[PDB]
Subunit: 484 residues, 4 copies
């Protein structure tokens, strides 16, 4: 039906498109744009473009594996079950050429799909059409039709012409990069994990193509007595035995290992070996690079924590701090950050208000709801108050509050025991969920009892500067607390 | 005794657990949670889980080394001293299967142990039970009992079935990663040093397994005349000579070196060689990646210092500063930072108050205690004052204070000689521990003598803005200094 | 003509020079400086220096490829068509020696061209003249003229003397680094892409030189029976067959692959092999390093985004946030940043005012021009206002404004639907380009209706603190809005 | 003389020591500390310790190269010219053992030299004395004296005992790391360049030791017919031919290349080959890691600039900015930063006042000295003023000032032409060194003429907020400018 047929060629309302265009109305604006052409635009983000590129990737990985092998290890590439594969697949890759004249293009420099037919055709014919046409049209069977209008020379030249189909790797690279830019925008794949699998796919393909080339150059020379295929006496081995050996040569030049049974004798086998070493050791260097980037991404937060701590050790050693105090600072960072690197002030500034308020109310509303100041207060005021709490960790023996010091802030216990070392009583061990220093906010005096950490206290603290900064926003609660 | 027996299965009060749950009361809350099941939960952080996984790791590293070798290089894996090892160890790995149906699970996405028996069993049977059961139960001896209900075919198939025990590597990977996540939370091991030793352990194991596989595939084919074992004439060498050669092949494919005495002749030896090259050169790329991450972590602070300084050189060169002044800025950074990278303002903001106050009193109380302003003052006031000191380094010939300039700050000497170049006297060389500019805080006038660095002075400075900011916090001392 | 001839030797008015000196008048000041010498200065940035170094690079890459080969694989380097190349090229490299005595020098430590003839000559004769003179003057043909004033010993020693021409690689390294420092300042090439192509060029050259050396040391020994050239029976193969094999040896020692057909027999072939392995595996390690740096530069922004997000996951897990809220924070970062890392506050502070104002007016003037407050206002006021807008993203179900809350800021919709959930009406779905909370700026009251995100809203927000901060700058508009 | 003899053992007054202790008085305090012991302390930073470790490093690199070779490739290590080297060198390494009982120790955890004799002896005997004593005392000649109190077994065992001298590598590692920690604190060597040369030195040594070991294990077995030395028929080749081959084996296992002429036949040669591959490929992985760290340090500032710019491209693409404006922002960053990364605000905050003032007066005093406001003002006031200048770059066509806009800041031209596009006159092209907007500071009105960039202006700007902030510091100049 024509409505569903047109619907496939437009950018759909889906998790990607509503994130790329930012609203379902901006998606509809782009659909209403695509409706300008006489079906002569399919959008780069359309379901048609997706499923077409998906069947093109499985078509093209299959074809870029099968074509090197059928051109290299098989006689009679003019046979019915082989020309049926090549005419069918070159039809699919010619439909794909026609589709790219009507396919838009994602202009990264303007963040817009070009999406107009004369602009798409003129940019495409200037960008990639020559490699796409050469790799699309059956130039090998065209040359057989011209030559039928010498047999060993025709079978030589048609094998080189048939490897112009390998320029489908330009489309494989392109359609993979387009669909991976789209899939990062859909699934947040780790960059180095996408990149290592691009390169593992490229290594396997270039290793496979070198594996074919290592036999093809012997074959195009009619297996001279000084090439490895003749020296290994395997010019008449099965296509699979030959391919396995030829691949093993290429793979040994790739993965940095060796040769076949001998160093190359003939100058063409020697130069194809050097090319395959250059391509191979380039791939393996590129793969050690991607493996390194993968590894450095996978522990990146732990690596950044230990880099940050090493700057604490550099601070400690610059100031020549005693080993007893350096151990105290180490044990502080171990309890304050738990080996995790973040900036709370940075991250909370990157969030919206509702999401700060949800994070803050999950962390701190359980601590504050026990306090008689806040158990009876308005939910909007308490939500504004909890955002002013500063998290503090006190190691055992640290005085959180000292008797006779000015009451600049008051505290709440998330975890640990804090002993109220009062001037005329036994030490009341305030356990997790307790609160203290509360007379600082109401009375503006010096503290009436010291409070010291009896374990590694994890505290939330409320400065009287920040308390008053929030009470200026809620004068109804200010007049209420002023009653007591 | 039942109390001690139950006590092992709960999360203990230890350096890890009191840091993971954050308080001894939150540990007790988790112990009181674990008491819900009828012994049918042991906690993922329990001493039982630890010592069970510890004896499982030494059991499993031993077993994953011994099983490949006994299946590959030995005849008669049905013999008494071999079935005793396999029935005993498969009992231990079946107790371990049963233990995982009652073992909780650390849910990283919620930072909670799942710790309920129907939730643990349903998540486990959906996650890992198939690989754990196949690797637990003696499928090789089960197949011998079924087959006893052809001998060369049975001895072929039972060796492949017996390598289903190698799926204990899933448990080895898991129990190592669990105990290393726990040990980072206990000992702060360097991330890349833990990771390099995971991979060195994995390389040795995969090299050992490839070493076995390289002989096993020849053996399962009954040593055909075109495999390396037959070509090396070593089908009847000792198990140790065979293992050493087979390992050397695998290790040469791993560490990027070569083959045995020849490139592979038979297609199965050729493909097991290609598999071992792919696995091997993958491992070595992963190991160059981890070696690089280890190296970049080990000098990370020096690397970050020289990156920061290179931005000072980029600033100097952007501004086209004279080489004489660039050398002056270099010698300044050399004395100001001593090649150490830190941010004092960032690090002091990450600490608690008691730990800032201890660091500050260690650095600066020796400098300030000589001053007549502070030798007679209250310890709380001086501790508040010392935090306002800013560290400054003056190179020789730098005027710290100029005669007739406004007295915006006053100084204390940590190190170096600063000459008071007075307008009517000889230059009094103020040595380390001296102080100057002190009339700025009391008198609010322009300076009565210039002071210039005669060496690389390291100074602490007290702005009169920050002095007054601290005196507003201690009006009793403000009225006292106002007396003189 | 003398004016055009002098004009080539001065720093031109071009995209590089007007950026290096910063103005066409500072370029003219440097041209007027260069006019001090009697043509005895050509400037390091001059068109003469450029085109001279350009023809010197193509001369020198050609010569450093051709000289090793003609000295190694050819007899009779005293022949007419070979001495014509060497006398012509050594003339060009002697003109280049003379040009460097009159060429200035870019002093990186002062960001100034030294550009005075006695200072240039005295610095050059102290820096590089010995390597440049030895590589310039035909020391090989000088020695033949002295020796004509024994033939196998003369043909030995003249080949070693002729490889003193390979010290032109010092000039190749220098002129490449000078022109790449200039080209970074002209085209912003990716650092690692310039560096990888330096090293690929250096690898190809050192592989080529090792390839020559591997044959040259056999040749200088008159091909002893224990060197690879004699063992391969190829002392009489064509120069191209020999070069291809000798290169293949060197390339296999470089790219970590193997040897020739045998491990080296004679001690000189063995030590040249060890030298070529040390040089080769040094190059390949340097190339894996540059490949890694290239890869880590190419995905650097995605890598930095996933590092930043992993710190959000570390924050979430430190605070033990529920998996439901962690997913909410993930979906927030996905819509707030779209996988892109930047700091808007940092980047806008790095720009000038006109460029902030152009970026801000492109982003926000389409959103504000619908509002009745701003459709009728002055372009300078609106441009000042739009800079105070803060971008906020609200996930579906997030209340942007709550009824009865204080109106601290008002909003504009870039994208998404926000429902006005009014206390006495149906939910008016405000679509993209709408605005709400507008009574907050005029009336200073609590909000009269709640507004909640019905999709992922992308909003611009205007705090009443920042609105009043901008209206203090435009009192004419302040008195106008005070009318309504 | 006893004063000079004692003087060598104390920490001298030198560029390192005056930077490590921070003052010549703190150096004297450490010298006065060292005077506590009865010559039984030499300080870890002393000239004696330096020159002793310097002659120990050249002694020890020589010895750790010569001992493997003399034990491996030479008969009769009991001969006069060999026992003279070993008794002399083992005397030097026994004096060094005695020196370490009186040598202090740099405690990195407290940044103090331990420098007391019972504390030094007790820490040393617990830390390194066992490896130092075993490697110091002639255990090989002790065993010959005991055995003289069987000849092939004695010559076997004495070679293994003599390689206990190779535990001098513990001292080589230690004394290199101590002197490189001291030399970073003296010369600011690039971290990765020091580290790559540690590892190149370690690779050469381990390659040399493997090269010896590869022959030594054959020799200790009396050259069995299945080891490479016997298969290569070279048990009677010269020591140099054997060493060159044995080294080549080890070096090929190190640099990832191959074997000797064959894969190993005997199980001991096979296992020494596997050990040498494990050690070798570990070294090469460690060396690719250090090469990568060296490369990533060498372009680190350019890499950081292109990372920062890529965040500007991520900002531009997140905001979907037009390609015309993205090019404008690119050309802005190219002129604003010139491809150089720094933070001016960060770097100027890290400096002292005199060095900020020197940098600022070099940059800006030439620009301000033309202005009639500042040509007649006091040097202290102008130096305070120039620090308030903010550098701004305006691209051509950018309006710096607009007619009728409020005069919030005034400008000075460092470079470029800015046209005063006056409302009633021809465009006065203000060239480099001019100033404009000057009526903003005196008159507080809207601008009387627009000023637009006619080239890429580089400007210094003075906000009237910052002008008034500086004039509050100099009321004498405030009352003077108030006269006009
Ligand atoms: C005889 C010597 C035996 C020694 C046994 C020690 C066993 C300890 C193993 C711990 C393994 C582990 O702790 O876990 C490492 C996670 O593994 C990793 O880090 C990285 C894994 C990399 C493996 C790549 C395989 C590539 C495959 C290609 C297929 C075609
Ligand atoms: C003939 C040529 C002789 C040359 C002698 C030069 C000696 C200078 C040595 C300084 C060593 C050093 O300065 O210290 C480097 C710290 O060492 C390092 O950086 C990294 C050490 C890496 C070694 C890995 C061994 C792996 C083992 C496996 C066992 C199975």
């Amino acid at each position: 039906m024509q409505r569903q047929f047109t619907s496939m060629l437009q950018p759909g309302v889906n998790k990607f498109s509503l994130r790329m265009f930012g609203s379902q109305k901006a998606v509809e604006k782009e659909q209403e744009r695509v409706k300008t052409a006489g079906f002569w635009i399919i959008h780069p983000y359309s379901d048609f473009r997706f499923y077409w590129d998906l069947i093109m990737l499985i078509m093209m990985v299959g074809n870029l594996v099968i074509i090197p092998v059928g051109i290299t290890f098989f006689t009679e590439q003019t046979t019915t079950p082989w020309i049926i594969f090549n005419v069918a697949s070159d039809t699919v890759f010619l439909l794909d050429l026609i589709m790219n004249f009507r396919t838009g293009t994602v202009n990264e420099d303007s963040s817009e799909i070009i999406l107009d037919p004369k602009v798409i055709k003129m940019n495409y014919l200037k960008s990639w059409f020559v490699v796409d046409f050469i790799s699309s049209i059956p130039v090998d069977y065209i040359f057989l039709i011209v030559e039928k209008g010498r047999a060993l020379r025709i079978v030589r030249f048609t094998k080189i012409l048939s490897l112009l189909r390998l320029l489908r790797l330009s489309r494989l690279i392109r359609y993979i990069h387009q669909w991976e830019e789209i899939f990062h925008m859909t699934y947040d794949l780790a960059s180095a994990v996408v990149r290592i699998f691009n390169l593992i796919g490229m290594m396997l393909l270039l290793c496979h193509w070198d594996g074919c080339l290592q036999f093809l150059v012997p074959l195009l020379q009619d297996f001279p007595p000084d090439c490895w295929v003749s020296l290994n006496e395997m010019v008449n081995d099965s296509w699979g035995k030959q391919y396995s050996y030829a691949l093993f040569k290429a793979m040994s030049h790739m993965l940095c290992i060796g040769y076949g049974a001998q160093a190359p004798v003939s100058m063409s086998d020697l130069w194809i070996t050097m090319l395959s070493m250059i391509v191979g050791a380039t791939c393996y260097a590129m793969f050690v690079g991607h493996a390194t980037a993968l590894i450095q991404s996978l522990d990146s937060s732990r690596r950044q924590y230990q880099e940050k701590y090493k700057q604490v050790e550099q601070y400690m050693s610059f100031h020549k701090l005693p080993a007893d105090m350096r151990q105290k600072i180490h044990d502080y960072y171990e309890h304050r950050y738990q080996g995790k690197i973040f900036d709370e002030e940075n991250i909370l500034n990157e969030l919206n208000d509702p999401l700060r308020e949800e994070i803050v109310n999950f962390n701190c509303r359980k601590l504050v709801a026990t306090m008689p100041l806040f158990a009876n207060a308005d939910p909007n005021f308490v939500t504004a108050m909890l955002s002013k709490l500063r998290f503090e960790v006190f190691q055992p023996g640290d005085y959180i509050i000292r008797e006779g010091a000015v009451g600049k802030k008051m505290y709440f216990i998330q975890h640990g025991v804090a002993g109220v070392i009062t001037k005329s009583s036994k030490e009341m061990k305030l356990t997790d969920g307790s609160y203290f220093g509360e007379i600082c906010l109401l009375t503006k005096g010096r503290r009436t009892a010291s409070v010291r950490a009896d374990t590694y206290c994890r505290l939330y603290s409320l400065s009287v500067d920040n308390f008053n900064e929030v009470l200026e926003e809620y004068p109804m609660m200010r007049r209420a607390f002023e009653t007591v």
